[PDB]
Amino acid sequence: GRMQMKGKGKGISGSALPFKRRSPKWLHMTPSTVVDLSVKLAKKGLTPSQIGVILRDQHGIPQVRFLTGQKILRILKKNGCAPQLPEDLYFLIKKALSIRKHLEKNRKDKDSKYRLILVESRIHRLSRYYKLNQKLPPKWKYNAQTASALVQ
Amino acid sequence: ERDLLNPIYEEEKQKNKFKRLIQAPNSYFMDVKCAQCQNIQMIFSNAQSTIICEKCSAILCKPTGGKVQIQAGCAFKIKN
Amino acid sequence: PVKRRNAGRSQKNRGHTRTVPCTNCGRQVAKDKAVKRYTVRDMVDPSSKRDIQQKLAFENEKQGIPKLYVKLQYCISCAIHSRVVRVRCAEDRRIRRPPI
Amino acid sequence: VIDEVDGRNAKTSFYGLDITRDRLCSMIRKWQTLIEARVDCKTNDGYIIRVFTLAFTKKTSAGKQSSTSTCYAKSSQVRAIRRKINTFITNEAAKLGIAEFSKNLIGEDYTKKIEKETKNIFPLQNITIRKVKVLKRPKLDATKIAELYSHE
RNA sequence: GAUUAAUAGGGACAGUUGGGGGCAUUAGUAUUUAAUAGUCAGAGGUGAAAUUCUUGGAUUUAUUAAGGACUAACUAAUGCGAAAGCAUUUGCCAAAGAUGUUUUCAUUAAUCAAGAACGAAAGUUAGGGGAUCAAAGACGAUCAGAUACCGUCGUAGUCUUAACUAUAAACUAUACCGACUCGGGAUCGGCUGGAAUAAAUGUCCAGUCGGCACCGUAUGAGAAAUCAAAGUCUUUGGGUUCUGGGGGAAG
Ligand SMILES: [Mg+2]
Ligand SMILES: [Mg+2]
Ligand SMILES: [Mg+2]
Ligand SMILES: [Mg+2]
Ligand SMILES: [Mg+2]
Ligand SMILES: [Mg+2]
Ligand SMILES: [Mg+2]
Ligand SMILES: [Mg+2]
Ligand SMILES: [Mg+2]
Ligand SMILES: [Mg+2]
Ligand SMILES: [Mg+2]
Ligand SMILES: [Mg+2]
Ligand SMILES: [Mg+2]
Ligand SMILES: [Zn+2]
Ligand SMILES: [Zn+2]
Numbered sequence: 001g002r003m004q005m006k007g008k009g010k011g012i013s014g015s016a017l018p019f020k021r022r023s024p025k026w027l028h029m030t031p032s033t034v035v036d037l038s039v040k041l042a043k044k045g046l047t048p049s050q051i052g053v054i055l056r057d058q059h060g061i062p063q064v065r066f067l068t069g070q071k072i073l074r075i076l077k078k079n080g081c082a083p084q085l086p087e088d089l090y091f092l093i094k095k096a097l098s099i100r101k102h103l104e105k106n107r108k109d110k111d112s113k114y115r116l117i118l119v120e121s122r123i124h125r126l127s128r129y130y131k132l133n134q135k136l137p138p139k140w141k142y143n144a145q146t147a148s149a150l151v152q
Numbered sequence: 153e154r155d156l157l158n159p160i161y162e163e164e165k166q167k168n169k170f171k172r173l174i175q176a177p178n179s180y181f182m183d184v185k186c187a188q189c190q191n192i193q194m195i196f197s198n199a200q201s202t203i204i205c206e207k208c209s210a211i212l213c214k215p216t217g218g219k220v221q222i223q224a225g226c227a228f229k230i231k232n
Numbered sequence: 233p234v235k236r237r238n239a240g241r242s243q244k245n246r247g248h249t250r251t252v253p254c255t256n257c258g259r260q261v262a263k264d265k266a267v268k269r270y271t272v273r274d275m276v277d278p279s280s281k282r283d284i285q286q287k288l289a290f291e292n293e294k295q296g297i298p299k300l301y302v303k304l305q306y307c308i309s310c311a312i313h314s315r316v317v318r319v320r321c322a323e324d325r326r327i328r329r330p331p332i
Numbered sequence: 333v334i335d336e337v338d339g340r341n342a343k344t345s346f347y348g349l350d351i352t353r354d355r356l357c358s359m360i361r362k363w364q365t366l367i368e369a370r371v372d373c374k375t376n377d378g379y380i381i382r383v384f385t386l387a388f389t390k391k392t393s394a395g396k397q398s399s400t401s402t403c404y405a406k407s408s409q410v411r412a413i414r415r416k417i418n419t420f421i422t423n424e425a426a427k428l429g430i431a432e433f434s435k436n437l438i439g440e441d442y443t444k445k446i447e448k449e450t451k452n453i454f455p456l457q458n459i460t461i462r463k464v465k466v467l468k469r470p471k472l473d474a475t476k477i478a479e480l481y482s483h484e
Numbered sequence: 485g486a487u488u489a490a491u492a493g494g495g496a497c498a499g500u501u502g503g504g505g506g507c508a509u510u511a512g513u514a515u516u517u518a519a520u521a522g523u524c525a526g527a528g529g530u531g532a533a534a535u536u537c538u539u540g541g542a543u544u545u546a547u548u549a550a551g552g553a554c555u556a557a558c559u560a561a562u563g564c565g566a567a568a569g570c571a572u573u574u575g576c577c578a579a580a581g582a583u584g585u586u587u588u589c590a591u592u593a594a595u596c597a598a599g600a601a602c603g604a605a606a607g608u609u610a611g612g613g614g615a616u617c618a619a620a621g622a623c624g625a626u627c628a629g630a631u632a633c634c635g636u637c638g639u640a641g642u643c644u645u646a647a648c649u650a651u652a653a654a655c656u657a658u659a660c661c662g663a664c665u666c667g668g669g670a671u672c673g674g675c676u677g678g679a680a681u682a683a684a685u686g687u688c689c690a691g692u693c694g695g696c697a698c699c700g701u702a703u704g705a706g707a708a709a710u711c712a713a714a715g716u717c718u719u720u721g722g723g724u725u726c727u728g729g730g731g732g733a734a735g
Contacts, residue, residue: 002581003493003593006566006660011694012491014585016169016177024586026181026231049496049588053200060181060194060231062586072588074486088495088589095579102506102578110602111505114566115579117601126494129592168692170491177586178676198585198675200498217499218584218675233709239656242561245696247654248569248604250559263559270362270557301357303557328561329399333547357557366558370511370573382511388558392687399560400670407502407563409685414573453685 004118023067027060031068034061035075042081048072049087085151086135092123093142093152100144180230184212187225194231195220236325240308241265254307256314267311271302335472345472345480346434349464356386359458364389364403367410367456369417372467373425375433377476380468381425383437383461385417387450390457405454412453420449431480437461 002009037059041051052072055061065071076082083090099116103109123142130136141147156173164172179197186193189208198218205212214221222228241264243249251260275298276284288296311317320327336343360366369385389403397403405413424442425433436442443459450456472480 001492001661004566005581008695009581010661011582012170013583014169014177014693015587016175016491016585017489018176018586019174020586024181024231047496047588052587053497053585054587056585056587057196057199057201058194058203062181064587066586070486071590086495086589088592091495098578106506106577109506109578111565111580112578114601115505118566119579122494126592129494133590133592166691168491171692175491179584179586181586196586198498200585200587215498216584216675219499234656235709237656237710238561244561244656245563246569247565247567250571252556264561298352298354301353301557360558362558363560364558368558368572384512390686394687402560402562402671404560404562406685408500411574412685418573451682451684451686455684455686 004121017063021066024062027062027067029059029061029067034064034067035079038064038072038075039079039081042076042079047087048076048083086130089123089126089130089136090152092119092126093147093150096120096123096142097148097152100148180232182228182230184222185227186210186212195228252305254310255304256310257307259307259309261305261307265308267306267308267317269304269306269316271304272299273302275300335477343477343481345469345477346430347466349434349437349461351460351462355460356462359386359388359460361388361397363397363399363401364391364457365405365410367405367413368462369414371418371421371425373422375425375428375430377430377433378470379430379466381430381433382465382467383421383425384463385421385446386458386460386462387413387417387446387456388458390455392455409454413450413456416449416453417446420446434464437464 002011034055038051038055041054046054049072052064055064061067064075068075070078073083096116096119099112099119103112103116106112120142127136127140127142131138131140159173169176169178181197182195184193184195185191186205186208188210189205191205191207193203193205193212195203195213197220199213199215199220201215202211203213203220204210211223212226214223241249241262243262243264250263252263252266253259254261254266274281281297284297290296306314306316312319333345333347334342335345365388367387367389369387371383371385373381373383375381389405391397391401391403393401395401421442424436424445428436442461446459447456450459
């Protein structure tokens with residue numbers, strides 16, 4: 001299953017959403033207060049996902065959308081703090097670059113060259129998606145040098 | 153004797169969370185009382201990284217692998 | 233006609249295993265494939281033992297003559313010829329922990 | 333090693349420590365992990381020594397160790413065990429003279445202590461000092477070679 | 485005015501796990517050689533032997549040193565890696581699975597002509613290096629003949645920088661993603677409870693997720709050997725690349 005690992009890649013990491021869609025009974029936070037916290041965290045430069053984690057561990061908010069009705073990114077969009085490049089793609093490029101970095105120096109390292117090939121492959125593969133779905137500028141390309149100056 | 157439609161509780165509890173009928177999670181949320189300043193906070197069962205109580209800044213929980221380590225004299229109750 | 237399911241070597245979950253020279257000949261053999269027996273023998277014929285144990289200067293020896301430790305590794309041609317291992321019927325062929 | 337000739341009899345100073353083949357292959361068993369730990373230390377006596385330590389995985393579970401009764405310790409646990417043994421030795425080395433150090437080394441003191449450090453990480457059996465080498469030995473003044481002789 | 489949120493997939497994060505990779509470090513005997521001490525007449529090698537080495541003192545003994553390799557024993561129906569392959573210490577660099585998630589994205593996925601990254605060994609080019617073995621070669625022996633099996637030597641090679649080369653019985657001779665069909669212990673990595681103690685990176689017990697396998701068994705398959713897939717095929721259709729059509733000629 002796990003993408004681009006043929007043969008044995010296949011296993012199940014967890015998350016399982018409970019049945020109750022209604023927010024939990026012990027939870028006393030107004031959806032507005034939540035949107036406030038999430039936006040504060042956001043302006044502090046966090047990720048929709050990282051925000052999710054923070055709200056869940058510290059703040060007793062299990063699922064933000066079952067509280068608000070808006071998923072985290074949509075909230076970020078309406079309220080104007082927006083993560084210009086999708087967190088998703090962002091990390092993939094950060095990675096491909098860390099591999100660039102390490103690889104320019106150790107030029108005899110073959111595994112890391114191959115890993116890079118894989119990661120860049122995924123990056124293009126995500127680009128197509130975010131392009132056809134209008135989440136990325138149409139002429140936007142990942143190059144070594146272009147993407148290195150691209151907010152990553 | 154077995155019925156797929158009325159599976160037995162003690163069995164489903166034993167099964168992996170994805171292999172149950174309702175596909176229900178194993179995590180909880182807990183109210184935790186700081187040993188020092190006696191503040192109550194909410195903590196996710198498998199919570200990531202570390203938690204410090206907001207009043208006195210002392211350490212409540214430590215991260216692992218799905219367990220959180222409640223540190224020292226911090227008392228807790230599961231919320232449900 | 234696959235003869236063994238094992239195919240003779242204990243190796244799975246890897247491409248390659250280190251090669252060992254055979255004790256008897258020195259032929260390179262796979263470390264999985266090799267017939268390996270660990271030997272703890274005594275350096276000396278029991279009679280010879282009597283003779284020596286008479287003459288041992290330090291009386292504080294209780295079994296105070298060392299054993300000889302050998303890790304013996306045979307290629308197949310050798311361990312067959314040399315009878316360390318021998319031909320068995322199809323059914324017995326798969327028997328795993330046999331001795332005494 | 334002979335530091336001195338006095339009157340038809342040759343005085344000797346410390347040179348090395350070691351082990352019989354027997355007492356080694358005695359201790360080597362299949363189905364446990366063989367730990368080995370090498371250290372480099374200075375005496376205040378002015379000596380540089382290299383100590384090799386040997387240790388084995390101790391089975392607790394109460395069966396006869398076998399193909400079934402596998403005893404291995406995780407490689408990481410091994411590493412922590414090295415780090416700990418090694419550290420302790422360098423400490424107990426810097427504070428002692430070579431007389432002291434050798435006396436302690438030959439005997440069973442260090443084995444006791446080492447088991448006590450090690451046990452958290454993993455229970456160990458027949459801790460041993462496999463060998464000692466003397467890297468760099470100062471020449472002995474008449475004084476210290478007299479103080480080495482000092483016999484009761 | 486935004487369907488769920490796939491026991492779909494990507495991403496985040498948390499404690500781990502590994503003989504995965506790249507740099508540095510570092511050890512260890514061993515082979516070979518040298519030095520310094522010793523002692524002497526034989527060492528080697530074989531089925532016997534002979535080539536060899538030996539009084540200029542070999543083999544042998546003790547202590548050092550030089551120089552290239554190599555990681556024993558622990559070492560396993562154990563682990564990792566896409567495969568080739570990967571086993572000494574420590575430090576650094578980037579990478580990875582599985583598990584854990586009441587985190588986020590929301591079909592982003594499967595397979596794949598083009599086109600690309602790898603790819604044992606041997607071999608090739610330009611420098612290094614050269615201890616061990618060792619194609620070619622030189623010799624001994626064996627033999628009717630040995631340009632062979634054995635022995636004494638020995639070059640290229642073996643190791644290394646930069647480069648080529650693209651091949652193996654590169655083997656589970658078994659395509660990849662996905663369902664579903666028996667039973668049982670054990671094993672490696674996570675997690676979840678429980679128990680004992682000398683109270684822990686350790687034991688045991690019961691769960692479970694993922695690995696490598698094994699042992700029974702099939703009123704399932706097969707020409708059989710056999711196969712928990714090589715089953716759910718004339719009761720013939722889940723998705724997708726590849727390959728074969730008597731033997732030689734002939735890769
Ligand atoms: Mg799956
Ligand atoms: Mg192979
Ligand atoms: Mg165990
Ligand atoms: Mg050396
Ligand atoms: Mg292992
Ligand atoms: Mg050359
Ligand atoms: Mg003749
Ligand atoms: Mg030779
Ligand atoms: Mg536990
Ligand atoms: Mg058929
Ligand atoms: Mg039949
Ligand atoms: Mg079977
Ligand atoms: Mg058909
Ligand atoms: Zn507090
Ligand atoms: Zn042999």
